[PDB]
Design a protein around this ligand. Structure first.
Ligand code: ANP
Ligand code: MG
Length: 273
């Protein structure tokens, strides 16, 4: 069943209408997260290799959960009459990046560099697996505090990666690009890069740059904290108004500000210990 294979603990997270529980796999006492998804809340369905009807979130998790990566892996899933239950890896101790920034404030650039680099590697992994996350933000990034490793979570707004235009979007609006706000259309990669620019600004300034649609479409970036010129340049490049003017993942990682990144363990010893 499910209640027999796992020892269910308390609900995780604060606020929201989701239902993710802390759990432990009885067989080996492995820490897990038990995520419940309401069928009536599912708008995008897909089919696994076998051809079964499941939430797109499951399809995408399966595609990226092969091997090691900076993405939280799906260990198993169950279908119930009115919902699906996903068993996910659970780092311990852990803290999501949103809470981390709330407590620490704007992050030192060395730390932001390490974190951003890991997010880039995780997103590249997703794209390599043919998956577009569509909801990259601090709330969807978990920090494995002891290892200094970041993990991407929640593919509930994702889609299969494609080269044609997307005209649907259910991610976080303040991280969405101007082309979506104005024309209700975008391409996967350039929209992802825009969200990464928002995330990087969030890390080095302690809050997102835009709150209203008018600010997003104007694209003017004001830095509220002291940020190096190189970092500002990278952020402004990711936030270019024209999609084709934004950097590719390769250009981001070859940017001067991204050089000499700390290793995950070094990051934990210096900034998380
Ligand atoms: N693998 C995990 N390990 C530890 N905590 C997790 C894990 N997955 C999810 N959580 C917690 O559950 C919360 C929401 O996860 P999420 O995948 O966004 O579920 P959700 O259905 O989209 N609920 P919400 O985002 O609040 O509307 C996060 O804020 C975490 O604190
Ligand atoms: Mg969520």
């Amino acid at each position: 069943p499910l209640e027999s294979q796992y020892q269910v603990g308390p609900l995780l997270g604060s606020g929201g209408f989701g239902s993710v529980y802390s759990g432990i796999r009885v067989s080996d006492n492995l820490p897990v997260a038990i995520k419940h998804v309401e069928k009536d809340r599912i708008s995008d369905w897909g089919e696994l290799p076998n051809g079964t009807r499941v939430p797109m979130e499951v399809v995408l998790l399966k595609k990226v959960s092969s091997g090691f990566s900076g993405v939280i892996r799906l260990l198993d899933w169950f279908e119930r009459p009115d919902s699906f239950v996903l068993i996910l890896e659970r780092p311990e101790p852990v803290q999501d990046l949103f809470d981390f920034i709330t407590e620490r404030g704007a992050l030192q650039e060395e730390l932001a560099r390490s974190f951003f680099w890991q997010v880039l590697e995780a997103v590249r992994h997703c794209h390599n697996c043919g998956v577009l996350h569509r909801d990259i933000k601090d709330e969807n990034i978990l920090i494995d505090l002891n290892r200094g490793e970041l993990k991407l979570i929640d593919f509930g707004s994702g889609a299969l990666l494609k080269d044609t235009v997307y005209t649907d979007f259910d991610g976080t609006r303040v991280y969405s690009p101007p082309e979506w706000i104005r024309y209700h259309r975008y391409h996967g990669r350039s929209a992802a890069v825009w969200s990464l620019g928002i995330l990087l600004y969030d890390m080095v300034c302690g809050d997102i740059p835009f709150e209203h649609d008018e600010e997003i479409i104007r694209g003017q970036v004001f830095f509220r904290q002291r940020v190096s010129s190189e970092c500002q340049h990278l952020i402004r490049w990711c936030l270019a108004l024209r999609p084709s003017d934004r950097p590719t993942f390769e250009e981001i990682q070859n940017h001067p500000w991204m050089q000499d990144v700390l290793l995950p363990q070094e990051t934990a010893e210096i900034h998380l210990h």
